[PDB]
């Protein structure tokens, strides 16, 4: 996260760290959606241009974390993966269209003050919140700058941007399965997701029922926090039918 702030304790209890076993390093962000299911970006697990193809045994999910590097004894819970499910129409060749994956945990995670699932939006939640100007929140342990690493989870609040402005900021083809967010150069305010934040959640707090909903997944960008450029997010509601199908089994 570039131009963000340190998160408060228990501020994002659905925040998951995808952790590589060997070498011991941060793989990606992710989110807790139930006691057994974790949501992330497909590119965190499968990305042939960079020879990325992680299997279940290659990683661990670390839930309830705040500190990036420390082992948070009695706070964080470390879970093993049973199975990874990548969207069958995930487009890694061109624009990361349908950049979504699910991970089933071997055992259910016990909820605590620091571990709690986020909601997934329904059609009405998405129609009412996914509006240009409405702000969401992005969290992660990724880079503090494009060109370094935070000690604790970082947070940034960012406005959803009009689809024509997203389209006009890039030469990449934008699909209906994506949305973009961030401030314009005229807005003065800064902020963006960056490398290592991928797979993390873009959340919004419903003013109707006061619940947090995951509207997006940190997907891609061209650099980090560049003027005239915006962060791109996987549109969670547009891919809910696939999510439901995988979970129903």
């Amino acid at each position: 996260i570039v131009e963000g702030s340190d998160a408060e304790i228990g501020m994002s209890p659905w925040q998951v760290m995808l952790f590589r076993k060997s070498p011991q390093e941060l793989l990606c962000g992710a989110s807790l959606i139930s006691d057994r299911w974790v949501l992330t970006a497909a590119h965190c697990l499968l990305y042939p241009p960079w020879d990325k193809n992680f299997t279940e045994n290659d990683l661990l999910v670390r839930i309830g974390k705040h500190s990036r590097t420390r082992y948070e004894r009695n706070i964080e819970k470390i879970s093993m993966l049973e199975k990874i499910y990548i969207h069958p129409r995930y487009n890694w060749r061109e624009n990361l269209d349908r950049d979504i994956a699910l991970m089933k945990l071997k055992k259910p995670v016990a909820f605590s003050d620091y571990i709690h699932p986020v909601c997934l939006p329904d059609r009405e939640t998405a129609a009412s919140l996914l509006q240009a100007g409405y702000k969401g929140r992005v969290t992660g342990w990724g880079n503090l700058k494009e060109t370094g690493q935070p000690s604790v989870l970082q947070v940034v609040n960012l406005p959803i941007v009009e689809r024509p402005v997203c389209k006009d900021s890039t030469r990449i083809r934008i699909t209906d399965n994506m949305f973009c967010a961030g401030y314009k150069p005229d807005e003065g305010k800064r902020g963006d997701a960056c490398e290592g934040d991928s797979g993390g959640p873009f959340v919004m707090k419903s003013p109707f029922n006061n619940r947090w909903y995951q509207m997006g997944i940190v997907s891609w960008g061209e650099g980090c926090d560049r003027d005239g450029k915006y962060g791109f997010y996987t549109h969670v509601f547009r891919l809910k039918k696939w999510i439901q199908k995988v979970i129903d089994q």
Partner: peptide, 27 residues
Amino acid sequence: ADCGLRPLFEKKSLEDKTERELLESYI
């Protein structure tokens, strides 16, 4: 269920430092 309600915030009726910024944007 109790999804999206944080034990240290909504469950206690405590607000985090920037959640009002989100609410103010929902015009």
